[PDB]
Amino acid sequence: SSFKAADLQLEMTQKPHKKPGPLVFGKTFTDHMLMVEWNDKGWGQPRIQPFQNLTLHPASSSLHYSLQLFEGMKAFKGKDQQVRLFRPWLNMDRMLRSAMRLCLPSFDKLELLECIRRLIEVDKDWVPDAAGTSLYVRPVLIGNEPSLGVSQPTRALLFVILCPVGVTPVSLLADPAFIRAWVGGVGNYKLGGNYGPTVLVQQEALKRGCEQVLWLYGPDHQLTEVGTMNIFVYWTHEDGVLELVTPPLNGVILPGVVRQSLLDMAQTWGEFRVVERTITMKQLLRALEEGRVREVFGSGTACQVCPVHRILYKDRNLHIPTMENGPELILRFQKELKEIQYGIRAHEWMFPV
Amino acid sequence: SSSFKAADLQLEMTQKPHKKPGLVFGKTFTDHMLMVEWNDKGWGQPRIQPFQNLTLHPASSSLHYSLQLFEGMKAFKGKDQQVRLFRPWLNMDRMLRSAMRLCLPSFDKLELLECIRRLIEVDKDWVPDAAGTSLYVRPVLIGNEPSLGVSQPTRALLFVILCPVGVTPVSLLADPAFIRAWVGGVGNYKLGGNYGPTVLVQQEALKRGCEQVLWLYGPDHQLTEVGTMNIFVYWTHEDGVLELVTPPLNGVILPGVVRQSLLDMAQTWGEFRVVERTITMKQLLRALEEGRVREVFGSGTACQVCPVHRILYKDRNLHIPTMENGPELILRFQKELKEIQYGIRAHEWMFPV
Numbered sequence: 259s260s261f262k263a264a265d266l267q268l269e270m271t272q273k274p275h276k277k278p279g280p281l282v283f284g285k286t287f288t289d290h291m292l293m294v295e296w297n298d299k300g301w302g303q304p305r306i307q308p309f310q311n312l313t314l315h316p317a318s319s320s321l322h323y324s325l326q327l328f329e330g331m332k333a334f335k336g337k338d339q340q341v342r343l344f345r346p347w348l349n350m351d352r353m354l355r356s357a358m359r360l361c362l363p364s365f366d367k368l369e370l371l372e373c374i375r376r377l378i379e380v381d382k383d384w385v386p387d388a389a390g391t392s393l394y395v396r397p398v399l400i401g402n403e404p405s406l407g408v409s410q411p412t413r414a415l416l417f418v419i420l421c422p423v424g425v426t427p428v429s430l431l432a433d434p435a436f437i438r439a440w441v442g443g444v445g446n447y448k449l450g451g452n453y454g455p456t457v458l459v460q461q462e463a464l465k466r467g468c469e470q471v472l473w474l475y476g477p478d479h480q481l482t483e484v485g486t487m488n489i490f491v492y493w494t495h496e497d498g499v500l501e502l503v504t505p506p507l508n509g510v511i512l513p514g515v516v517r518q519s520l521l522d523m524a525q526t527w528g529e530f531r532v533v534e535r536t537i538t539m540k541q542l543l544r545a546l547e548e549g550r551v552r553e554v555f556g557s558g559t560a561c562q563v564c565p566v567h568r569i570l571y572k573d574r575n576l577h578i579p580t581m582e583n584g585p586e587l588i589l590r591f592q593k594e595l596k597e598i599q600y601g602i603r604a605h606e607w608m609f610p611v
Numbered sequence: 612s613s614s615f616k617a618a619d620l621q622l623e624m625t626q627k628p629h630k631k632p633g634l635v636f637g638k639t640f641t642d643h644m645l646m647v648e649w650n651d652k653g654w655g656q657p658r659i660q661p662f663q664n665l666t667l668h669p670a671s672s673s674l675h676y677s678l679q680l681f682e683g684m685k686a687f688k689g690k691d692q693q694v695r696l697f698r699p700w701l702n703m704d705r706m707l708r709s710a711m712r713l714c715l716p717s718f719d720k721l722e723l724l725e726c727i728r729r730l731i732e733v734d735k736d737w738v739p740d741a742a743g744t745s746l747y748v749r750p751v752l753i754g755n756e757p758s759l760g761v762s763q764p765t766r767a768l769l770f771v772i773l774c775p776v777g778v779t780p781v782s783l784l785a786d787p788a789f790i791r792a793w794v795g796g797v798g799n800y801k802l803g804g805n806y807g808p809t810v811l812v813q814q815e816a817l818k819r820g821c822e823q824v825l826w827l828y829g830p831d832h833q834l835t836e837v838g839t840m841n842i843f844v845y846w847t848h849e850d851g852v853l854e855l856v857t858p859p860l861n862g863v864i865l866p867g868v869v870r871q872s873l874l875d876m877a878q879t880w881g882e883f884r885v886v887e888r889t890i891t892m893k894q895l896l897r898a899l900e901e902g903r904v905r906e907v908f909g910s911g912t913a914c915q916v917c918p919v920h921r922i923l924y925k926d927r928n929l930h931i932p933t934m935e936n937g938p939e940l941i942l943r944f945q946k947e948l949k950e951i952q953y954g955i956r957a958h959e960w961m962f963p964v
C-alpha cells in the first residue's frame with residue numbers, strides 16, 4: 259500500500275559538507291536525502307541517508323522512456339527560527355496525480371509529507387534565514403524497470419533532495435512556432451518530459467534578445483505560461499470591468515500552487531473581478547493600445563511573482579507597463595505571501611516542520 | 612565542437628562472462644557496453660567496458676527534465692555467421708537530429724557507428740542465428756547536469772547496450788481523446804518524453820479489449836501511428852488506383868527506418884502507386900464499406916511488420932480484412948526484408964560487423 263514514516267531508517271552523514279558563506283538556484287545541496295524503493299513486494303522502508311549518487315541499471319525506464327516526475331516546494335524559516343512549508347498538501351496531491359498519469363506506484367500523501375518533514379528537520383541548519391531566502395524541496399519519483407519494453411514499471415524509486423536558495427522585470431519572446439503542451443497531452447502534469455524540449459526554445463529567446471519564453475497555444479495565440487511559470491494579467495477588460503485573469507485549467511496549464519494561492523487571495527479580498535479565462539495576443543494588443551493593461555506577471559515557486567515589462571511578438575516589440583503601475587498588485591501579493599510564509603501572521607497554509 | 616574518435620577506443624574485457632541464453636524483448640543484455648562522457652572539456656575517450664550500472668548525481672537533468680533520447684536498430688547473423696546491421700546510418704542521422712533538439716552534444720555519426728561496430732564485434736557471440744532472431748542495439752544519449760535549473764547541460768553521457776531478441780494480427784483502440792504528438796512538438800524525434808505518457812493509454816486499450824493504440828490527430832481524425840509503429844494502408848484509393856499510403860513526415864510522424872524501407876521497396880517494384888498522404892478515419896470507413904481496403908499494418912524495428920484486423924472507433928468495431936488478403940503485401944515485404952537482413956541477397960542496406 260504505502261511506506262510509513264514510522265519505519266523511517268535514519269542514517270546520519272559522516273562527511274558533512276561546508277554550508278555557503280551567492281545562492282544560485284538548484285545547484286547547492288544539503289547533507290541528506292530521502293530514499294524509498296518500490297518493487298513487486300511493494301514499498302521498502304524509507305531512509306534518510308547521506309546525499310549520494312543514484313546507481314541505476316543502464317536499461318532503467320527512467321532514462322529511456324521518461325518515466326519520471328518531480329515536485330517543487332519551499333520551506334521558510336521565520337524570525338522565531340521556526341521552519342514552515344508552504345501549502346505542501348497541494349504538492350503531495352499534484353505529485354500523486356503525476357504518478358497515476360505515468361503508471362508509477364501510489365503512496366500515502368501524509369506519509370510522504372512526514373518523511374519530508376523529518377528530512378528537513380534533519381537538515382534544518384541548511385535553511386537560511388536572510389530576507390527572501392528559503393529551502394527548495396525537490397521530490398522525484400522515477401520508474402526503474404530494467405527493460406526496453408514500453409510498459410508499466412514493476413520497480414520505482416522515490417527520492418527527495420533539498421537546496422538552499424537566495425523585483426526585476428523580464429522580457430519574453432512570443433512566437434506561435436513554439437508549443438509547450440497541447441489539449442490531450444500531459445502539459446498539466448509536472449513530468450520531466452515537458453521540460454527537455456523547452457531548452458532549445460529558451461536559447462532562441464536569448465538569441466532574439468529576450469529573457470524567457472511566452473508560450474502561445476492555438477490558432478488564436480492564447481498566452482498560456484511564461485517560462486516555467488503561470489501567467490496573470492491585471493487589466494480593465496473589454497467590458498470595462500477591472501479584473502485579474504489567468505488561463506483556465508483546460509489541459510495545457512500546469513496547476514501551480516502559487517497560481518491557486520493568488521486566485522484565493524484576490525478572490526478573498528473581493529475588490530475586483532477574478533477569473534480563469536483564456537487570454538489571446540489579439541486581446542492583449544488591443545488592451546495595450548487602449549491603455550487598459552496594468553500588470554502582467556508570472557507565478558511559480560522558485561521565483562514567486564515575476565513582473566513582465568516587454569513582449570516581442572514576431573517583430574513587434576510590445577511595452578508592458580507593469581512597473582509604471584506600481585506594480586501595485588504584485589507588491590500586495592508579495593507582501594501578503596511574505597507575512598504568511600515567514601510566520602509574521604499565523605496561517606492555515608503553513609505546515610510547521 | 613569536435614567528436615570522440617573510434618581510434619581512441621579503450622577496451623576492457625569482462626572478467627566474468629555471463630551465460631548466454633538457450634527471450635522476452637529487451638530484458639537480457641550482453642557482456643559489454645559502450646560509454647562516452649562529455650563535459651566542458653568536450654568528449655572523452657569512448658570505451659568498451661563490461662556491462663555495469665550508471666552512477667548519477669541525484670539532480671541529474673536526465674531524471675528531472677528528461678534530457679534523454681534513444682535509438683533502436685537490429686543486427687542479424689546470416690548462415691555464414693557474418694553479422695550485419697540494417698541501415699544503421701539512418702539511425703545515426705536520426706540520433707543526431709534528436710541530440711540537437713534537446714541541446715545535447717553533437718558527435719560524429721561515422722565515429723559512433725564504428726564504436727558500435729567494435730562493440731557488437733566484441734560481443735558477436737551473443738548475436739543469435741536461429742530463424743527470426745536478432746540482436747537489438749540501444750544507443751542512448753542523456754544530459755547529466757547536477758542542477759535543478761532547466762538549462763542546456765554542460766555534461767552528458769552516451770552509452771550503448773545490446774539485447775538478443777527472438778504474422779499475428781492485432782486490434783487497435785482509436786480514441787481521439789489521447790494525443791501522442793502535435794504539429795510544432797517533438798513527436799518526430801526519438802525522445803524518451805514521447806513514450807512515458809503512452810503507458811496509461813495502452814492500459815486503457817487493454818481495458819477496452821484492444822491490444823494497441825491507433826493514434827489519431829486533428830479534428831479530421833488522421834491515422835498517424837500504431838503503438839510504437841508507423842502505419843501503412845494498402846487499398847484502392849477514391850480515384851480507383853491501387854496504392855500503398857502512409858502519412859507524410861509533417862511533424863507528428865516518427866520517420867521510421869522500416870517505414871522508409873517499405874516505401875523504397877514498393878517504389879523499386881513499380882507495380883502500384885506509392886504515396887505519402889494523410890489518411891483520415893472518414894476515408895478508411897468509406898473504403899471499408901466499399902470493399903477497397905486490402906491490408907492495414909504497422910512498421911517498426913522490434914516487430915518488423917504487424918497486420919491489423921480490427922479497430923474500435925466510436926464504440927463500434929471495424930473489421931479490417933488484412934489477413935483475408937493474404938496478407939500478400941505484408942508477406943512479400945517480410946520475405947524481401949528477411950532475405951536482405953540475413954544475407955540471402957546482397958544489399959547495400961546491410962553494414963557488416
Ligand SMILES: CCCc1cc(=O)n2nc(CC(=O)N3CCCC3)c(C#N)c2[nH]1
Binds near residue numbers: 470485556
Ligand atoms: C521546474 C521547477 C523548477 C524551476 C526551474 C527553472 O529553471 N525555473 N526557472 C524559473 C524562472 C522562470 O520560469 N521565469 C523567470 C521570469 C518569468 C519566467 C523558474 C520559476 N519560477 C523555475 N523553476
Ligand SMILES: CCCc1cc(=O)n2nc(CC(=O)N3CCCC3)c(C#N)c2[nH]1
Binds near residue numbers: 781837912
Ligand atoms: C521504443 C522502441 C522499442 C520498442 C518498445 C516497445 O514496447 N515496442 N512495442 C512494439 C509493438 C507495437 O508497438 N505494436 C505491436 C502491434 C502493433 C503496434 C514495438 C515495435 N515495433 C516496440 N518497440
Ligand SMILES: *Cc1c(COP(=O)(O)O)cnc(C)c1O
Binds near residue numbers: 486515516557
Ligand atoms: C512548476 C510549474 C509552474 C508553477 O507551479 P508552482 O506549483 O506555483 O510552483 C507553472 N508552470 C510550469 C510548466 C511548471 O513546471
Ligand SMILES: *Cc1c(COP(=O)(O)O)cnc(C)c1O
Binds near residue numbers: 683836840868910
Ligand atoms: C521507433 C519508432 C517507430 C519506428 O521506427 P523504426 O526506425 O522503423 O524502428 C515509429 N514510431 C514511433 C513513435 C517510434 O518510437
Ligand SMILES: [Cl-]
Binds near residue numbers: 345346347348606607
Ligand atoms: Cl492548502
Ligand SMILES: [Cl-]
Binds near residue numbers: 698699700701959960
Ligand atoms: Cl541506408
